[PDB]
């Protein structure tokens, strides 16, 4: 996260860290949506251009963390993966369209003050909150500049009008994405960066006070570049697939 700030303890109990076994390193962010399922970006697991193709036994999921590098004994929980599911129509060849993936945990994780699932939006929540100007929150242990934070970082960013998103890049944007970030003349800044991928973009519903994950950190060109914006996978648009997988394999 660029131009963000230190997160408070328990501020994002659904935040998950995708951790590589050998060598031990931070791969991406992810989110907890139930006691047995984790949601992340498909490009965190599969991306042929960079010879990236991780399997179940190559990774570990670390839940309830705050510090990036330390093993937070008695606080965090590490889990193994039973199976990984990547959207069958994930387009890694062109624009990362449908950049989404689900991960089934070996065993259910127990919730606590630092481990709690985020909600998935229903049609109505998505319709009323996913609007230009409205702000969401992004979290992650990614780079601070286009070096690395000691603890989880947080930044609040406004959703941007589709036309502006389209006109800021040469990449073909689809309805399964939305972009966020401040405009070069708004003064404030901030953005996701390397290492933040797969992380959650959330919003708090003013109707029932619950937190909903509206997007997944997907892609960008540089980090916090003026006139550029971060792009996120539109979670609701792909909820049909999400539900299909869960009640068919869970």
């Amino acid at each position: 996260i660029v131009e963000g700030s230190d997160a408070e303890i328990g501020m994002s109990p659904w935040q998950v860290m995708l951790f590589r076994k050998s060598p031990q390193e931070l791969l991406c962010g992810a989110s907890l949506i139930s006691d047995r399922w984790v949601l992340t970006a498909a490009h965190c697991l599969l991306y042929p251009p960079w010879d990236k193709n991780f399997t179940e036994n190559d990774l570990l999921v670390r839940i309830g963390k705050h510090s990036r590098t330390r093993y937070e004994r008695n606080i965090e929980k590490i889990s193994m993966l039973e199976k990984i599911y990547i959207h069958p129509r994930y387009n890694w060849r062109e624009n990362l369209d449908r950049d989404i993936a689900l991960m089934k945990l070996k065993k259910p994780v127990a919730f606590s003050d630092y481990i709690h699932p985020v909600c998935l939006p229903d049609r109505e929540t998505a319709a009323s909150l996913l609007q230009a100007g409205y702000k969401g929150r992004v979290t992650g242990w990614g780079n601070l500049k286009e070096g690395q934070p000691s603890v989880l970082q947080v930044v609040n960013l406004p959703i941007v009008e589709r036309p502006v998103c389209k006109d800021s890049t040469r990449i073909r944007i689809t309805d399964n994405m939305f972009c966020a970030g401040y405009k070069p003349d708004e003064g404030k800044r901030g953005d996701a960066c390397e290492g933040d991928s797969g992380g959650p973009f959330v919003m708090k519903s003013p109707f029932n006070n619950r937190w909903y994950q509206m997007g997944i950190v997907s892609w960008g060109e540089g980090c916090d570049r003026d006139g550029k914006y971060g792009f996120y996978t539109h979670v609701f648009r792909l909820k049909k697939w999400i539900q299909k997988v869960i009640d068919q394999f869970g």
Binding site: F19, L60, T69, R70, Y71
Partner: peptide, 11 residues
């Protein structure tokens, strides 16, 4: 610079 996690998870 990651701290060694318990081998019980790396097994």
């Amino acid at each position: 610079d990651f701290e060694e996690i318990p081998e019980e998870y790396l097994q």
